[PDB]
Amino acid sequence: MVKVKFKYKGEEKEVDTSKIKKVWRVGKMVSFTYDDNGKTGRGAVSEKDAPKELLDMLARAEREKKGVLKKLRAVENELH
Amino acid sequence: MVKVKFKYKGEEKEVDTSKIKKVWRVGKMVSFTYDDNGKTGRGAVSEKDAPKELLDMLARAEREKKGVLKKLRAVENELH
Amino acid sequence: MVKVKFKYKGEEKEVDTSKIKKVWRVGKMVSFTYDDNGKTGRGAVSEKDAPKELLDMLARAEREKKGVLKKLRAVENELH
Amino acid sequence: MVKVKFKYKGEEKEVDTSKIKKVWRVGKMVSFTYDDNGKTGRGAVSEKDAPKELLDMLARAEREKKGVLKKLRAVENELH
DNA sequence: CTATATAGG
DNA sequence: CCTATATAGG
DNA sequence: CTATATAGG
DNA sequence: CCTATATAGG
């Protein structure tokens, strides 16, 4: 039962890592989005203050991305 | 923190979903590679036994692969 | 030295099949574009009144397209 | 109407560019398949001897493959 | 000698 | 996979 | 038995 | 290409 503690517009917030819809890195930052009851809830926390399960999500996200990319890059070279 | 239990090569294995590096769907089967303490490990359970957590990871990978698929399905119909 | 005789906005026009930049079919029609000295020159002539070299261009165009498509379609199914 | 002259399997061939079904570039080589009277024929000349007409066909195929490549190169950088 | 891009085999 | 083509690379 | 999606071999 | 997994298909 891990929760990512972050701030959004200065206010403290706590999302349930399992309610997080997607993750990605922007430098040192680990941004993400959650389902805050119907709408898109944004948030980002610096890597060093991020729960491990959030980093795992980010990791799998970057891996999932690289793959799609390596696959996209492929179709491009087939067009020279 | 959920230990998904499976049987690989006759060995009743059990890996914490946190170690999961990648999850993908093959029919009604959910396969995944995990961090087998340094090296890449593998395992598969039937969707039926997949803990909701693992299925969420899978749903995140898919949610993304479906967005790019949208753009491709785009640039596609934009035939001529 | 083939020229496609077509009408554009009621006016007669004659483009040099080799000055045609690209072709594609829209039903019975064979549309295309030419380099009318710097800018994009449009035109379309029904298939039955189209020079053979224009049909060959259309043919290769549809073949070139199908290929790119068959290649695009591929990358999509790799994302299920 | 230009007869591109080439040597295939020791046979000094010569096909009217009108019969060309597809042209593509392989290094400084221009390959192409033509309509060998019903069946698909093949041939290749060095860009150097390619009549401007054939090279135009090639330029049309490429012009298009470069547009799709643009959209893919698009949906690509649009990482996250 | 294989690589390169391709279609038919 | 192989072919057949022009040229490159080492 | 292969197909299916995949990563490491 | 092979493996190893759940299930499908015939």
Quote the DSSP letter at residue D27.
T
Q: Report the C-alpha gap between D33 and D26 in whole angstroms.
A: 13
Å between B40 CA and nearest CA of chain C? 22
Task: Please spell the DSSP secondary structure of A14-75, one letter per residue.
Answer: EEEGGGEEEEEEETTEEEEEEESSSSEEEEEEEGGGS-HHHHHHHHHHHHHHHHHHHHHHHH
Q: Are C53 and C17 in contact (CB under 8 A)?
A: yes
Question: Residues with Cβ < 8 Å from B22, sequence gap 6 or more?
Answer: A60, A63, A64, B32, B33, B61
Å between B14 CA and nearest CA of chain D? 33
CA B55 → CA B4, B31, B32, D22, distances in Å? 11, 11, 11, 47
Q: Which residues pair with B43 in a beta bridge?
A: B32
Q: Report the C-alpha gap between D53 and D48 in whole angstroms.
A: 13
Domain B1-80 sits in CATH 2.40.50.40: yes
Q: Report the C-alpha gap between A58 and A60 in whole angstroms.
A: 6
Which residues have CB under 7 A from strand F? D 6-10, 26-29, 31, 42-46, 48
Q: And the tokens for C14? A: 């004659």
Q: If DSSP codes are grouped into helix, strand and coil, which group holds residue C80?
A: coil
CA A57 → CA A9, B17, B58, C30, C65, distances in Å? 23, 11, 11, 51, 39
Query: What kind and span of H or E run contains D71?
Result: helix D52-77
Q: CB distance B18–A52 less than 8 Å?
A: yes
Q: Solving technique for this entry?
A: X-ray
Quick one: closest CA in A to B24, which residue?
A64
Q: CB distance C75–A71 less than 8 Å?
A: yes
Q: What residue type is B41 in one-letter code?
A: G
Q: What residue type is B76 in one-letter code?
A: E
Q: Report the C-alpha gap between C79 and B10 in whole angstroms.
A: 31
What is the distance of C-alpha A6 from the center of its chain? 13
Q: Are B45 and B6 in contact (CB under 8 A)?
A: yes
CA-based nearest residue to D57, from C29, C64, B78, C35: C64
Q: Give this entry's resolution in angstroms.
A: 2.6
The dihedrals phi and psi of B79, each to the nearest 5 degrees, come to -60, -105
Kindly report each contact of residues B8-11 with a partner whose C-beta sits within 8 Å and lies 24 or more positions away, as own/partner: B8/B42, B8/B43, B8/B44
Q: If DSSP codes are grouped into helix, strand and coil, which group holds residue D24?
A: strand
Distance C10 CA to F9 C1' (A): 57
